[PDB]
């Protein structure tokens, strides 16, 4: 107790960072930001372990102070800046843009995206309220506040963000049949074509989710991210497309190409 903690020991970081248990007592503690601590990329992990661009923590720092790495169009020169679901990690040099998407196993995978469509992001609206002077606003899954939204926008919807201005370009209503993403839970990293949800008045709204291979599964409402209509999505899915291919046929698939 006695105050907020400023360290994060190893064996206590989220398991999807894939940090080796040995070779160091501590792991990069995410700073306060638009995403929670456990659901965080932070850049030192991403720029050193994921892309292998940097070897040490000192030269991770050097990259940012040259204003190379920018997040969502802002430089964000912080070593442990928390990057979360679908935050557009763009690099002006080397003309490459990365989007943060969960792979089939629920870990963060490198997803290179074209410059044309790397200028927007989707945000799941968390709450819709009235601000001061009677100005309505919405809060996305990454804390952004957007004023004067469309009146038809309600809770649990997903909104496309211009990523250059604070205004919104498009939105998708949370109805049955829409293409959804699993963010959290046991089934994390799957795309599942929502079918039906059970109200459960009082707490923990649930929803049934069916894979493209007719493999249905259930997850809490908090863990589902609608990403478009059935069929064509609004984002480029990573390799695997969220199928949860079984371990028995995973060895068969990897044996095909060797």
């Amino acid at each position: 107790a006695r105050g907020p903690k400023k360290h994060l020991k190893r064996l206590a970081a989220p398991h999807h960072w894939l940090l080796d248990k040995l070779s160091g007592c501590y792991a990069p503690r995410p700073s306060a930001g638009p995403h929670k601590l456990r659901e965080s990329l932070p850049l030192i992990v991403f720029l050193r372990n994921r892309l292998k661009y940097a070897l040490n923590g000192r030269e991770v720092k050097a990259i940012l102070m040259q204003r190379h790495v920018k997040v969502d169009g802002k430089v964000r020169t912080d070593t442990t800046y928390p990057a979360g679901f679908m935050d557009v990690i763009t690099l002006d040099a080397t003309n490459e843009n990365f989007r943060l998407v969960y792979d089939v196993k629920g870990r963060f995978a490198v997803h290179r995206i074209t410059d044309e469509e790397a200028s927007y992001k989707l945000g799941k609206v968390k709450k819709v309220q009235l601000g001061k002077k009677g100005v309505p606003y919405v809060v996305t899954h990454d804390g952004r506040t957007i004023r004067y939204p469309d009146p038809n926008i309600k809770v649990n919807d997903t909104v496309k963000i211009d990523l250059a201005s604070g205004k919104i370009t498009d939105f998708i209503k949370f109805d049955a049949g829409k293409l959804v993403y699993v963010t959290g839970g046991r089934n994390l990293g799957r795309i599942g074509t929502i079918v039906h949800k059970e109200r459960h008045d009082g707490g923990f709204d649930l929803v049934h989710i069916k894979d493209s291979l007719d493999n249905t599964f259930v997850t809490r409402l908090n863990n589902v991210f609608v990403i478009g209509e059935q069929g064509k999505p609004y984002i480029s899915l990573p390799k695997g497309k969220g199928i949860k291919l079984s371990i028995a046929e995973e060895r068969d698939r990897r044996r095909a190409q060797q």
Binding site: V135, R147, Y148, D150, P151
Partner: protein, 171 residues
């Protein structure tokens, strides 16, 4: 004796102990909000003193060799703009940029005077910053008024379409 200073006009020509704090003499805090207990000596003068500090408020008739005959200058001249103004007291447009007291120091054969600086001196750089903030307040308000207007007409059309939709209903 023993070097314990006097607390100004307190009481008790003997020695006492007091909880000394910030903005109080005889103690210099080493931490924020720290208070400490230190022995202090009373204001009333007694034979136990080793040194008594004195100051002259009105000169007599004889000249003291080390006190009145000698004279030392003040170490530093004014730095702020109006501090220089009141030192000379000429006007409000004196343009003290060339009225700065300078101190010549001979590092080597070269000589320079290093007039320090002026604080709170009007500069076009300062005027530019005032213009920027003044314009930024107006520029933001302009966007806010039109933003609510666009939402107002968007909401009005939405209500009109709903009103038309229910008009078609119920025959």
């Amino acid at each position: 004796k023993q070097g314990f200073p006097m607390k100004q006009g307190v009481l008790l020509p003997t020695r006492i102990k007091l909880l000394l704090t910030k903005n109080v003499s005889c103690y210099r805090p080493r931490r924020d909000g720290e208070r400490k207990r230190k022995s202090v000596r009373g204001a009333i003068v007694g034979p136990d003193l080793a040194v008594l500090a004195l100051v002259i408020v009105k000169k007599g008739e004889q000249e003291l060799e080390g006190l009145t005959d000698t004279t030392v200058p003040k170490r530093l001249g004014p730095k702020r703009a109006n501090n220089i103004r009141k030192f000379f007291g000429l006007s409000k447009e004196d343009d003290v940029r060339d009225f700065v007291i300078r101190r010549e120091v001979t590092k080597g054969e070269k000589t320079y005077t290093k007039a320090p600086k002026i604080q709170r001196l009007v500069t076009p750089q300062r005027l530019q910053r005032k213009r920027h903030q003044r314009a930024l307040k107006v520029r933001n308000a302009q966007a806010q008024r039109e933003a609510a207007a666009e939402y107002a007409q968007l909401l009005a059309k939405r209500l009109s379409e709903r009103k038309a939709e229910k008009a078609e209903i119920r025959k």
